[PDB]
Design a protein around this nucleic acid. Structure first.
Ligand SMILES: *C[C@@](*)(O)[C@H](CCCNC(N)=[NH2+])NC(=O)[C@@H]1CCCN1C(=O)[C@H](N)Cc1ccccc1
Ligand SMILES: *[C@@H]1O[C@H](CO)[C@@H](O)[C@H](O)[C@H]1NC(C)=O
Ligand SMILES: [K+]
Ligand code: NA
Lengths: 29, 259
DNA sequence: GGTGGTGTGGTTGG
């Protein structure tokens, strides 16, 4: 499968966890 | 974890609890990197100043957990250890340089919605993501505050905690402490001038500092909770084992001993 | 309870 780092309950369901956006925004700001 | 919040279910499916057989207690965090290999901090297994020197038979790994203390009946998986591999140049005498260990499970573990491995970074990922001001995420069942002491109960969380923290510039890490820092470490946490707070703490060692790649949507383990001075103090920052720097050792152990 | 506190469970049986 080679599916390290993809969470069954989040990435695999196209669902975001409650604070991951903070992480992504840090790569900008 | 200080000033974090309760993890969501399945948020960190690579999170592992290192559990002492007897007496029955939380020992450290750890992370699942395949079906058979767990990564943790060396000081969780070997620390002669505290009289700690665990063998394989002394410990279990508990995978898929959310609650700190409850056996999560049909959810968690408990594994025994084949073998422990401590970095041969782990420096417990001075500064916990190379605070890293691998634990090979006696049998592979089947994955689930709650149990899934994190990725380890390659050079490119590490150069891209491990930059000051970028944030990663630390998880653990350790103390909720620096603990003044000696008892603890209210200081421990009921469920796994999570906090996101920014990577700090090396000169700032260096000037923050008189302990000798190395390239096998990085530091993370907010500056006093940033306002927000948060840190790992005692009992969080071995837990992963992860980052989500904006290129491929995967989580990568960039660090291992290693050390600090106090917890969440202003002008102090948590220290983490730099996984990528130690990755050739990781690869050598797995290539030679693995399944 | 069982290596918490409530469930016609829960991140899971009875
Ligand atoms: C074993 C881990 O649970 C723990 C993690 C602490 C993280 N702290 C913060 N604020 N993020 N590590 C330790 O307790 C290590 C093990 C040895 C002592 N130690 C320390 O962190 C001391 N507080 C400082 C230290 C002493 C000796 C060598 C290096 C650091
Ligand atoms: C840790 O203790 C084990 C248990 O026997 C021993 O074999 C190992 O050499 C120890 N290392 C140190 C520094 O005590
Ligand atoms: K029950
Ligand atoms: Na701080």
């Amino acid at each position: 499968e080679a599916d390290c780092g993809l969470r069954p309950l989040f990435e695999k369901k196209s669902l975001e966890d409650k604070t991951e956006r903070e992480l992504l925004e840090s790569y900008i700001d | 974890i200080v000033e974090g919040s309760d993890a969501e279910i399945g948020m960190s499916p690579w999170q592992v609890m290192l559990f002492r057989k007897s007496p029955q207690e939380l020992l450290c965090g750890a992370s699942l990197i395949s079906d058979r290999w767990v990564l943790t901090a060396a000081h969780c297994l070997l620390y002669p100043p505290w009289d700690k020197n665990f063998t394989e038979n002394d410990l279990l790994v508990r995978i898929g957990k959310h609650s700190r203390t409850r056996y999560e009946r049909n959810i968690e998986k408990i594994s025994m250890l084949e073998k422990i591999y401590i970095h041969p140049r782990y420096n417990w005498r001075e500064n916990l340089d190379r605070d890293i260990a691998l634990m090979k499970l006696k049998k592979p573990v089947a994955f689930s919605d709650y149990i899934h491995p994190v990725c380890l970074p390659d050079r490119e990922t590490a150069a891209s993501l491990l930059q000051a001001g970028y944030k990663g995420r630390v998880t653990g069942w350790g103390n909720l505050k620096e603990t003044w002491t000696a008892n603890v109960g209210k200081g421990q969380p009921s469920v796994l905690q999570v906090v996101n923290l920014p990577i700090v510039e090396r000169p700032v890490c260096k000037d923050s402490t008189r302990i000798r820092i190395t390239d096998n470490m990085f530091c993370a946490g907010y500056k006093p001038d940033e306002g927000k707070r948060g840190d790992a703490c005692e009992g969080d060692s071995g837990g992963p500092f992860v980052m989500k790649s904006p290129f491929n949507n995967r989580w990568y383990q960039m660090g291992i909770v290693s050390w600090g001075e106090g917890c969440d103090r202003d002008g102090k920052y948590g220290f983490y084992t730099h996984v990528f720097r130690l990755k050739k050792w990781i690869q050598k152990v797995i290539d030679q001993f693995g399944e």
